[PDB]
Amino acid sequence: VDPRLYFENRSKFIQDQKDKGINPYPHKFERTISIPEFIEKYKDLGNGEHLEDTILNITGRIMRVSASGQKLRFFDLVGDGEKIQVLANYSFHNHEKGNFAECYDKIRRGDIVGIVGFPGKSKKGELSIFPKETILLSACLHMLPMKYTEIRYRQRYLDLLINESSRHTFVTRTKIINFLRNFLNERGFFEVETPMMNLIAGGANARPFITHHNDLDLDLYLRIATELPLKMLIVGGIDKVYEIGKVFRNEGIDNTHNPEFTSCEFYWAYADYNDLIKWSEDFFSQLVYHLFGTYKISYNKDGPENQPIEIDFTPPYPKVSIVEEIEKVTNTILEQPFDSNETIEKMINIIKEHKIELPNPPTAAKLLDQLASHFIENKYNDKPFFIVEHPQIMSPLAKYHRTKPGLTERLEMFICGKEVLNAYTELNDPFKQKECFQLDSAFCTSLEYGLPPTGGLGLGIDRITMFLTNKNSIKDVILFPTMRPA
Amino acid sequence: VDPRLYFENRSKFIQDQKDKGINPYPHKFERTISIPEFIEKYKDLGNGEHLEDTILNITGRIMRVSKLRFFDLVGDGEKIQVLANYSFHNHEKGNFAECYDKIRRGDIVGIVGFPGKSKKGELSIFPKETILLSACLHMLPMKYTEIRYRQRYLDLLINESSRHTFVTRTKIINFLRNFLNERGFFEVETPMMNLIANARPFITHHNDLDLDLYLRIATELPLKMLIVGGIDKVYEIGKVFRNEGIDNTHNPEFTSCEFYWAYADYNDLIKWSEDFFSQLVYHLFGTYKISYNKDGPENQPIEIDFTPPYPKVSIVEEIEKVTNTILEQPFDSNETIEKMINIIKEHKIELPNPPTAAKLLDQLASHFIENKYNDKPFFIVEHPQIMSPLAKYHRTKPGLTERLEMFICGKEVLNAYTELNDPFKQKECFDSAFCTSLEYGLPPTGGLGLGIDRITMFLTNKNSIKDVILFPTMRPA
Numbered sequence: 001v002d003p004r005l006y007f008e009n010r011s012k013f014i015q016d017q018k019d020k021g022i023n024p025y026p027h028k029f030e031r032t033i034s035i036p037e038f039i040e041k042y043k044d045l046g047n048g049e050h051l052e053d054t055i056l057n058i059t060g061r062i063m064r065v066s067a068s069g070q071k072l073r074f075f076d077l078v079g080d081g082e083k084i085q086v087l088a089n090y091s092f093h094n095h096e097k098g099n100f101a102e103c104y105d106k107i108r109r110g111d112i113v114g115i116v117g118f119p120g121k122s123k124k125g126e127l128s129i130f131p132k133e134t135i136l137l138s139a140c141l142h143m144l145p146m147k148y149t150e151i152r153y154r155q156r157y158l159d160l161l162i163n164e165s166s167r168h169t170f171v172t173r174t175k176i177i178n179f180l181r182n183f184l185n186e187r188g189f190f191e192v193e194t195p196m197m198n199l200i201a202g203g204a205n206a207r208p209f210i211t212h213h214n215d216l217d218l219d220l221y222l223r224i225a226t227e228l229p230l231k232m233l234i235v236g237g238i239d240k241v242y243e244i245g246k247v248f249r250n251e252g253i254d255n256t257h258n259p260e261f262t263s264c265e266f267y268w269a270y271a272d273y274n275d276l277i278k279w280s281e282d283f284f285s286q287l288v289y290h291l292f293g294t295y296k297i298s299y300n301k302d303g304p305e306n307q308p309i310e311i312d313f314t315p316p317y318p319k320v321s322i323v324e325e326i327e328k329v330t331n332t333i334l335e336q337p338f339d340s341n342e343t344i345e346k347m348i349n350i351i352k353e354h355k356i357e358l359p360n361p362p363t364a365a366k367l368l369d370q371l372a373s374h375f376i377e378n379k380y381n382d383k384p385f386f387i388v389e390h391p392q393i394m395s396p397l398a399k400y401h402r403t404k405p406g407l408t409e410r411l412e413m414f415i416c417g418k419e420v421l422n423a424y425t426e427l428n429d430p431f432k433q434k435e436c437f438q439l440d441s442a443f444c445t446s447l448e449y450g451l452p453p454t455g456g457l458g459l460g461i462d463r464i465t466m467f468l469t470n471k472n473s474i475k476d477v478i479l480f481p482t483m484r485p486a
Numbered sequence: 487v488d489p490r491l492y493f494e495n496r497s498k499f500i501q502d503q504k505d506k507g508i509n510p511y512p513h514k515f516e517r518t519i520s521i522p523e524f525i526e527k528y529k530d531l532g533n534g535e536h537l538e539d540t541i542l543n544i545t546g547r548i549m550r551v552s553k554l555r556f557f558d559l560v561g562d563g564e565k566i567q568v569l570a571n572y573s574f575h576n577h578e579k580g581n582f583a584e585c586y587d588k589i590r591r592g593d594i595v596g597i598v599g600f601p602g603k604s605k606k607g608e609l610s611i612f613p614k615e616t617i618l619l620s621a622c623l624h625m626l627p628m629k630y631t632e633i634r635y636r637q638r639y640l641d642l643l644i645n646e647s648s649r650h651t652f653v654t655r656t657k658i659i660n661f662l663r664n665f666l667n668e669r670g671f672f673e674v675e676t677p678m679m680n681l682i683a684n685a686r687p688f689i690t691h692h693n694d695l696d697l698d699l700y701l702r703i704a705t706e707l708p709l710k711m712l713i714v715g716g717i718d719k720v721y722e723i724g725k726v727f728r729n730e731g732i733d734n735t736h737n738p739e740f741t742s743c744e745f746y747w748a749y750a751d752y753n754d755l756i757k758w759s760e761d762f763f764s765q766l767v768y769h770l771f772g773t774y775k776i777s778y779n780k781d782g783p784e785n786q787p788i789e790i791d792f793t794p795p796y797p798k799v800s801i802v803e804e805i806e807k808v809t810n811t812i813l814e815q816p817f818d819s820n821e822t823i824e825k826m827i828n829i830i831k832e833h834k835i836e837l838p839n840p841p842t843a844a845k846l847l848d849q850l851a852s853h854f855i856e857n858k859y860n861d862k863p864f865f866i867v868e869h870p871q872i873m874s875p876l877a878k879y880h881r882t883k884p885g886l887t888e889r890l891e892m893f894i895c896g897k898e899v900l901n902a903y904t905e906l907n908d909p910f911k912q913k914e915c916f917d918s919a920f921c922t923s924l925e926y927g928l929p930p931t932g933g934l935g936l937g938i939d940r941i942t943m944f945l946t947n948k949n950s951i952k953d954v955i956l957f958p959t960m961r962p963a
């Protein structure tokens with residue numbers, strides 16, 4: 001009951017075993033089968049049917065202890081997120097390697113044990129290892145919480161050990177990244193690594209982290225996006241390139257925002273806005289079908305206490321032009337240029353009339369993003385959708401819209417009001433790029449060397465995982481989300 | 487002849503073209519076939535075999551120029567010829583004369599035409615129409631030398647051996663991911679920013695939390711904690727940051743792969759290392775023996791035979807066999823410390839500052855053992871516990887660990903050991919998070935780490951680590 005008492009007395013137990021000549025952290029256990037392999041091998045067994053001739057070395061963590069008397073011990077053995085029973089029987093025990101009561105009265109919950117024993121099914125039909133000998137491989141000194149907070153995030157091993165849904169969540173995350181990596185690779189894409197720190201932070205609009213490099217003696221910027229070096233690789237003839245990796249934005253932490261998060265950015269030469277749209281639809285529909293066998297998934301947008309909303313990932317997804325729909329909903333045209341004093345003040349007026357929060361700073365791109373957020377981002381929640389054709393001031397690195405002046409060929413896919421995908425036709429015309437004289441002289445010079453018509457796309461893998469694992473917080477899909485020390 | 491004049495007059499030509507209604511950066515070209523697909527569907531065709539009926543839209547970059555024009559098109563690192571003949575050219579989309587002398591070198595162009603072979607046997611496409619997609623306003627060189635590392639796009643467009651280098655890099659990382667995944671390993675992401683960092687950390691500041699975070703020097707601790715959490719085969723491929731000095735084999739930000747494998751022993755990790763290196767080398771080259779220019783391209787390559795098993799060399803016992811001195815235990819005793827400094831002094835090797843026991847052991851191994859097998863990869867094994875405080879103790883050799891350290895051409899590429907999962911067996915507990923994970927119970931586990939850039943160096947025949955990183959962190963002028 002007292003945690004310090006349980007920990008201190010189990011440490012005392014460790015030293016008691018050591019003083020007793022038994023190493024509680026033995027050097028090695030020659031495991032022969034994993035718990036999933038055990039379950040797959042011996043699932044087709046009748047109740048009460050042993051396989052006594054088959055001597056297996058299996059390992060796992062003890063998660064339950066019970067007794068039908070001092071002579072019969074029941075345990076729960078977990079390994080790789082799968083469970084079998086442990087049916088210690090005084091008869092099947094090797095009494096020449098230890099006392100049965102001694103060898104099993106010491107086992108507590110959380111204990112990593114190695115078991116020499118045979119497979120079978122109990123009279124209750126439970127798949128079990130019947131141990132002839134059981135070796136504690138690693139003592140869990142602390143008391144393992146039953147199902148109990150910030151702890152899940154800090155000591156993530158506890159969260160993975162007690163909550164099966166947590167391991168399911170992270171297995172889904174890796175399955176998502178595997179599916180995306182495989183998807184791109186099947187489409188001829190080439191996975192690369194670009195620097196995590198650069199002399200600038202370009203690709204998006206966010207505060208960068210600053211870190212000091214000693215041997216170069218300079219303050220480098222943790223990359224906010226992989227956009228620029230990837231487009232440089234497109235210049236370098238890798239026409240189908242991508243990168244899955246962490247990007248850092250030194251901004252606010254909330255349930256959908258982490259300072260560091262897993263982006264996937266691909267750049268696909270000779271691909272236009274429709275190629276990016278079709279890619280987004282194909283990718284999300286195929287990934288959701290892969291992960292669920294259906295295109296419709298449930299998601300607790302308003303938390304687990306409220307009824308979930310069904311998100312239909314059936315393509316095509318609707319595309320909505322931001323400025324057209326802002327002018328429609330707000331019944332005011334945003335005159336170009338969108339950062340003219342008139343247009344800036346007009347957007348501020350629309351925001352003020354609607355009691356929508358004015359963003360810091362009230363730049364026309366930020367005001368446009370706030371207008372989109374309020375008026376169009378939270379109005380398709382049954383399916384994902386694209387907000388498209390953003391003003392060029394919102395996306396300096398996007399190619400100009402062919403037929404709509406001042407707009408771009410940008411697509412940004414939202415799921416339940418959250419931006420999971422940002423894509424557009426890359427601006428390949430160096431003269432048409434402002435800030436070519438943050439911005440890179442290296443990137444602008446690469447543009448001057450010829451960037452082919454490219455389509456770029458970026459995926460917030462953490463957010464996508466949030467939606468496909470039914471998690472409301474991004475801290476629930478990152479194994480060790482950055483937390484405040486206590 | 488002038489780079490700047492060529493740039494400026496190409497830009498003036500750009501503004502001209504834009505002012506004459508012509509778009510030198512068109513929005514979308516419906517390319518139907520790719521250059522590799524082209525050199526596949528028409529690789530084996532009769533010399534002189536044209537196909538007038540089959541129309542194809544193809545893109546590429548012009549790399550060479552020459553009523554009969556000849557170009558070179560490269561796409562995805564593969565070349566074809568272009569035969570501009572106005573016999574098949576569509577003048578309604580522009581006169582052939584004006585539309586072909588206009589194209590300069592390095593232009594990304596789209597081409598509507600038909601495949602064929604010429605009377606000389608060269609495989610080409612005859613364009614009925616050719617569109618400039620993106621002009622190269624600077625002159626691309628041919629020979630080129632920091633241009634390689636800074637403007638890597640030129641290095642990938644020109645050399646095509648760097649393209650093969652980085653395709654081999656991605657093939658190596660792909661193969662490593664597939665190799666681990668097939669072995670039941672689960673890929674995860676652990677934080678790149680930590681609250682704690684043997685090397686200097688990268689310090690950054692998070693503003694919202696108003697606190698300094700250190701870029702991870704390794705994926706070690708969180709991966710071990712994941713092992714505690716029941717992810718018994720866990721791994722991470724990603725950047726780790728050691729804020730120290732660059733050289734040809736150390737870059738402060740480098741790609742590490744670290745796996746932790748619950749219930750793995752020393753033999754397990756050794757077998758994994760041999761399997762992975764032999765099978766990766768075979769997956770790449772179809773053989774276990776590779777040719778690597780150890781001392782540069784000016785010298786003859788050495789053959790490295792990745793045929794398993796690889797030699798295992800105990801660091802202490804090989805130091806004692808090479809230098810003919812016996813080192814008492816503990817290895818940090820005053821007598822053994824002063825003895826250890828003495829072999830370095832006797833060989834005029836440099837003394838590490840500070841002269842810590844593990845540092846002197848590192849220096850002795852580096853001079854004496856690490857250059858004992860260059861014809862094959864090999865293992866320096868069983869490092870003393872003062873060299874590997876997170877490593878399990880050797881069971882039959884006192885004071886040693888089950889550590890294994892794989893080397894190719896005297897450069898280390900693999901560090902591995904069984905974890906000291908007994909919390910009370912290391913004074914590092916009496917990281918708080920890591921020690922608490924141990925207290926919750928870490929099984930016997932084998933951990934391993936791979937220097938991806940170094941493995942790529944050795945499999946791409948590159949002497950420097952900047953050659954296997956696409957954008958090495960360079961020094962501005």
Ligand SMILES: COc1ccc(Nc2ncnc(Nc3ccccc3S(=O)(=O)C(C)C)n2)c(OC)c1
Nearest residue numbers: 206249251257258259261419420421422458459460
């Ligand atoms: C702007 O200042 C920021 C930006 C980002 C994060 N952090 C974070 N973490 C997980 N996901 C996302 N996504 C996202 C956010 C915003 C917009 C678009 C996207 S996105 O469509 O995923 C795209 C990455 C393709 N951001 C942050 O927090 C500190 C602050």
Ligand SMILES: COc1ccc(Nc2ncnc(Nc3ccccc3S(=O)(=O)C(C)C)n2)c(OC)c1
Nearest residue numbers: 685728730736737738740898899900901935936937
């Ligand atoms: C201690 O101070 C350092 C350390 C390392 C780097 N950077 C770097 N860069 C590329 N490779 C390696 N490898 C390596 C180096 C040393 C030892 C082992 C290995 S390793 O076997 O590759 C490993 C991945 C198992 N280190 C550095 O940068 C300035 C500073």
Ligand SMILES: N[C@@H](CCCC[NH3+])C(=O)O
Nearest residue numbers: 225227422424456457458
């Ligand atoms: N770099 C963008 C994603 C790619 C946009 C198209 N190049 C972002 O971080 O939002």
Ligand SMILES: N[C@@H](CCCC[NH3+])C(=O)O
Nearest residue numbers: 704901902903933934935
């Ligand atoms: N932390 C090691 C890799 C694994 C060592 C044992 N788990 C390194 O960076 O070299």
